[PDB]
């Protein structure tokens, strides 16, 4: 709303929790054993994971829309889940072909023998984030019978030309 330039992917205020120094653990002398483990400070120590502070996205996590009826909407890993319960095991494949060209996607390879395809990078973005992107996807329709699973696999996230790893 009203802010001093930006604030789409960051935390408010400073990064005090990163800025602050490590703690000077106490080393009591022999025989002086105090019950200093009586608190609730169950803090595990490791290098996991992600970025920190502003570098750490506080983005509302991904989950796609019900683009198709009955879609199992949920992005996980690199895949946007959109599984569909129809009536025959060859309905999503032609639906996908229609959708691909409804979206005007450029296709690298077409598995017409099966029901899958490899696409190139298509540019997309949203001003609710401080960056712009491109996505390369592997589409896989999985004829389970009346239901066909729909795998929308982000083969590569490219930040408006910068292949994100």
């Amino acid at each position: 709303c009203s802010s001093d330039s930006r604030y789409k992917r960051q935390v408010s205020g400073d990064e005090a929790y990163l800025e602050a120094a490590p703690l000077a653990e106490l080393h009591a002398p022999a025989g002086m054993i105090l019950p200093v483990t009586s608190g609730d400070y169950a803090i595990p120590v490791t290098n996991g994971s992600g970025a920190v502070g502003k570098a750490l996205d506080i983005r509302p996590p991904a989950q796609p829309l019900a683009l198709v009826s009955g879609a199992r909407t949920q992005f996980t890993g690199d895949t946007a889940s959109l599984l569909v319960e129809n009536g025959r095991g060859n309905t999503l494949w032609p639906q996908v072909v229609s959708v691909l060209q409804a979206k005007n996607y450029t296709i690298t390879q077409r598995d017409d023998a099966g029901q899958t395809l490899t696409t190139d990078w298509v540019q997309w973005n949203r001003l609710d984030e401080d960056e712009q992107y491109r996505g390369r996807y592997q589409i896989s329709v999985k004829p389970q019978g009346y239901q066909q699973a729909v795998t929308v696999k982000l083969l590569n996230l490219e930040q408006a030309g910068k292949p994100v790893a």
Binding site: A28, G31, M32, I33, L34, P35
Partner: protein, 87 residues
């Protein structure tokens, strides 16, 4: 300094002479606890000693005091009733 008014400072956490007579060395922490419960202080890393000290300042006229501690051994058995008074 040369001041008459002073908010009194109190405290608590102490045993009366009656409470002292209620117990004796050899009694366990629980035997004591059965009517004297617990102090609001022990020995952070030593033993089972209980600290029942009374303090209270009377408007710039020094401070009153009865420091009583009860040293119990590792089995919770009272070994020493240190009924220290003021100073």
């Amino acid at each position: 300094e040369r001041v008459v008014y002073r908010p009194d400072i109190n405290q608590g956490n102490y045993l009366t002479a009656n409470d002292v007579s209620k117990i004796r060395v050899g009694m366990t922490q629980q035997q004591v606890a059965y009517a004297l419960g617990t102090p609001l202080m022990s020995d952070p890393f030593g033993t089972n000693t209980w600290f029942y000290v009374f303090r209270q300042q009377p408007g710039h006229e020094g401070v009153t005091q009865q420091t009583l501690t009860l040293t119990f051994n590792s089995s919770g058995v009272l070994t020493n009733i240190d009924n220290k008074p003021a100073l």
